[model samples]
Target chain A: QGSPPCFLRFPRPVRVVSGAEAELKCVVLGEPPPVVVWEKGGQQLAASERLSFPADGAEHGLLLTAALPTDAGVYVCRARNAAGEAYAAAAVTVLEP
Target chain B: RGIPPKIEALPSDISIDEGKVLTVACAFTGEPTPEVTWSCGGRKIHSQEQGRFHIENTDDLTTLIIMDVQKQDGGLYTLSLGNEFGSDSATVNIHIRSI
Candidate 1:
């Protein structure tokens, strides 16, 4: 037998001027709906006024907004279920206004 | 390309009222250190008459401070780090609201 696989999905890279609200979606599929965690530039997500992760269910996905320069970096979405873990990342850039 | 640039921050993002001071620092760990520049709204920053704008460079980090953060100062400020390999930037948005 083989271990079950966890899959993740997201939109293509995007560009937005500073001070504009930015949105990112993460979709994960697994048997048990793996626990989802978000990371920025290889650092664990922290609670801040600009960075936000709303409360939501697992299988469906997650939404975040209020992108700032501090928010500019590579974002990774990790999905962990009974089977194992899987992840996908998107590079976000904050352009000059 | 070499390793990616890393920058530590104060709360990553900071908010201040008009007439207050805003100080943000960024550190670099790479060969030849890194050239740090501070820009506002995509324009080169100029020397302030009253020393309102101060850029402090240390052995391992650079700090940009804006004294009396004004309404016009409320915009996107970027701390850009560049080297031969490539460049990376950390941005801070300054918002001014009445208290």
Candidate 2:
């Protein structure tokens, strides 16, 4: 039996100085396991030189190597499978470096 | 924009039969998401996120789904949401009817 996706923990808001490393994370629970993605400005994000999407087991994370002012905004983490979908959101505040 | 938390959607009253599932959803809005809690008779009812009594506190929605309601489930329930800037609350009367 497949279990509907559920979040074990929600990503907490992040506050970091520009050029500092910032990260947001959330854990999930599912029977068949779920796919996770990070979104900003309603767009999906991919791993880049400065940004990395790390997922180990049920834990998912979005890491910013060097946070910039432009990175300051709301971000959402969504997890889904055939059973169901669940999501959580957090804000990133980039202060002056 | 920093602002006080405000309730967007929540029913003021509900009536369900015994052995029926009771679901209470409270949607809210604020600059920063608010922390949500559910209480009945001044006792927090929504505890663990698993088991028969399930609770989900999402970004904008907080839900409590309780399976198999009983006559003692009838009461005045309260929902509290708060953030650094301000806090807000709402109440709902749950009436449990026997089958």
Candidate 3:
């Protein structure tokens, strides 16, 4: 009756200097509008001043402010609904500036 | 330092609607960590022209995620892992159906 959640765009590689703002974004579509989560370095992200999550829904990404060099790794964006689950992952590079 | 690639989890054949996402998640382990490679019906996954095939290998976990998958994407997808000691391979048949 309806389509499952799918990632129209996965997070692309991000390269940001330390103390800079970085954004990793993606596009998701489904019948019911799936739930999105941003994962970094193997841990789920909680919205904070330094790291931002979608306030409402479906901007579908992670935002970082004043990022540090140690905050670089593979970031995965996952989406799931009643239909199925989908995942996309890309790396972020935080360099010393 | 004497362990071969061992598959901790690899699912059986997968079937999904044509418009849905195609995901093959696998986990394995070995000493010194195994190098992972993926292929579909003898075609190297990364060598594809469009690069729709996305793969990530982190720690002992690996996955291949394909978006807007179609019938052409269906095949015998294989995961091959290798280390200093040995090599191990696991394969899954991906079946795509009309929506």
Candidate 4:
């Protein structure tokens, strides 16, 4: 049997800089949504006071928040399961008034 | 195809004095070494060889340098790592304080 090819893809590339809070949704479609890993740059993200992941789950996706001056960058979301591993990226920009 | 290049910050969070040298290191490990780029305030900063941004490579590390810090430099800085196959990126906040 051939595997379905695990994959990850972002809905969009450009996101507007909203107020202080923003929502970034990462969608993963594969055998089992894979073991989702959220990264900014290349580091494995851990829970902290300034940042939080409120929507990380098994089937659907994840939501990242606490948008601040330091929350801008290229966001990478990786999903992996028994078949293989795959990843996608999105850019986050913060606007100030 | 394979997994995309993963770009990450060295320290992740940093604070430096204005006019001082502020350097942030972005490291990635992938099939082909990713080409790195920097940006801030929604505007892409030009990466040059002479000043501002420079790329340095060793056997195990590829580092990005940001020289002569400023108030405008304070923001979420993005470091993108890309290759012919795929790409990834990491970010950090540069805090500039007057000394």
Best by TM-score: 2
Strongest candidate by DockQ: 3
Q: What lDDT does candidate 3 reach at residue B6?
A: 76
- Which candidate, 2 or 4, has the higher TM-score? 2
Give the number of the best model, judged by lDDT.
2
In candidate 2, which residue ranges exceed 4 Å CA deviation? B1-99
Candidate 1 chain A minimal-lDDT segment of 10 residues? A1-10
B1-99: candidate 1 lDDT, tens digit per residue: 375455543223345556655544444555556777778778867667256877777645665667665777777778777777677777766566566
* Residue A20 in candidate 3, Cα distance off native in Å: 0.4
Using Cα atoms, each model's DockQ against the true complex is 0.02, 0.03, 0.06, 0.02
Clashing pairs in 2: none
Quote model 4's TM-score for chain B. 0.73
- What TM-score does model 2 achieve against the real structure? 0.57
Give lDDT tens digits, candidate 2, residues A1-97.
Answer: 3765566765767899999999988787777897888877657897899999989998899999999999988776656665544555577889995
Q: Write the per-residue lDDT of candidate 4 for residues A4-96, one digit (tens) a residue.
A: 123333323334454455655555555544566667756877876656665545333334444666677766555545443444455667776
Give the runs in model 1 whose Cα sits over 4 Å from its true position: A1-97, B1-4, B9-12, B49-51
Q: List the candidate numbers ranked by lDDT, top first.
A: 2, 3, 1, 4
lDDT of 4: 0.55
Show the colliding residue pairs in model 4.
Answer: A40-B90, A41-B7, A41-B89, A41-B90, A42-B7, A42-B8
TM-score of chain B of each: 0.80, 0.89, 0.90, 0.73
